[PDB]
Amino acid sequence: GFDGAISDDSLRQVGESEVWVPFIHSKGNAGIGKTGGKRVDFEGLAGGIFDDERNGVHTSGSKHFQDNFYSFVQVANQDVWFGEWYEGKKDSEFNNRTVYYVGNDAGTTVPTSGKATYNITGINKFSGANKLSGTFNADFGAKTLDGSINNSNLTVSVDATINAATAAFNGTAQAVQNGTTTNGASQGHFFGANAAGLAGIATFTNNSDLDTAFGGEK
Ligand code: HEB
């Protein structure tokens, strides 16, 4: 199965990849694509000819249409990804921006106790040097996930509860960047055996400029 979510599905949408083009696009992987179109896989975008790799993040254009980009991050070595897409010049104007995660949930199991910490990074209008970073604390007995990540401008924190059977987590979120606080929502999933990684999104209806994708490894 494939688990994922996207903050705005008007233009892009996520799920299992659907396009087979020898040597570039492969079906059956974690993927993204035009709303109304077919999904391609991140595995083929990462390290491809349109990929621009900076500080652990992939930024890829499209062969097909200029002036829109995906910045995304792989969780460990799993087929699990989080990032954003936008239209515009690049690093510059983030029009119609949307944040997402999607992963293959094959083999995912969730502990029933006790505690673990995750290295987390986040994506919000990424331009090379501004990835978010920090730690999440999971308590598998209490079924809680909480933590925060930040860059120099923005801080996002999550407070979520864990559904161990589906490996989902769901709760609130808070953004600070900068001086002012905005309350929002958090959602995502654990991925991999023993919840080896996680990915999710933090969204803020009152200011979508704050919406942030995040993920990392235990
Ligand atoms: C980057 C790099 C790249 C490259 C090289 C490519 C190359 C290619 N490709 Fe691609 N794609 C892509 C990137 C890409 N691509 C993307 C990103 C997508 C999604 C959408 C957009 O545009 O964004 C796709 C998508 C896609 C699709 C789907 C569409 C719809 O909407 O439905 C198809 C069919 C294809 C094909 C193809 C081909 C045939 C080729 C060659 C030959 N593609």
- Give the helix ranges, DSSP H, for 46-150: none
Structural domain contains residue 156: yes
> Among 13, 14, 16, 21, which residue has the most ligand 1 atoms within 8 Å of its CB, making it the best to mutate?
21
Q: Is 25 assigned to a binding site? A: yes
Domain shared by 14 and 96, yes or no: yes
Experiment type: X-ray
What CATH number is associated with residue 128? Answer: 2.40.160.90
Structural domain contains residue 110: no
Q: Which domain holds residue 176?
A: 115-217
Domain shared by 120 and 209, yes or no: yes
Nearest to 152, CA basis, from 129, 184, 136? 129
Q: Quote the ligand 1 centre to 20 CA distance (angstroms).
A: 10
Domain shared by 182 and 155, yes or no: yes
Structural domain contains residue 30: yes
How far is 73 from 79, CA to CA, in rounded Å?
11
How far is 177 from 8, CA to CA, in rounded Å?
21
How far is 81 from 77, CA to CA, in rounded Å?
10
Find how far residue 106's CA is from the centre of its chain. Answer: 18
Atom number, ligand 1, closest to the C-alpha of residue 18: 28
Q: Quote the ligand 1 centre to 9 CA distance (angstroms).
A: 18
Structural domain contains residue 57: yes
Domain shared by 75 and 145, yes or no: no
Domain shared by 152 and 73, yes or no: no
Structural domain contains residue 52: yes
Give the torsion sign (CA, 198, 61, 5, 136). positive
Residue with tokens 């995040």: 214
Q: Helix, strand or coil for residue 65?
A: coil
Domain shared by 100 and 64, yes or no: yes
Nearest to 78, CA basis, from 62, 110, 101? 101
Domain count, the chain: 2
Q: Helix, strand or coil for residue 195?
A: helix
Q: Is 58 assigned to a binding site? A: no
Domain shared by 48 and 92, yes or no: yes
Burial 43-71 (b: 16+ CB within 10 A, else e): bbbbeeeeeeeeeebbbbbeeeeeebbbb
Cis preceding linkage at 178, omega within 30: yes
Q: Quote the ligand 1 centre to 40 CA distance (angstroms).
A: 7
Tokens for 186? 């958090």
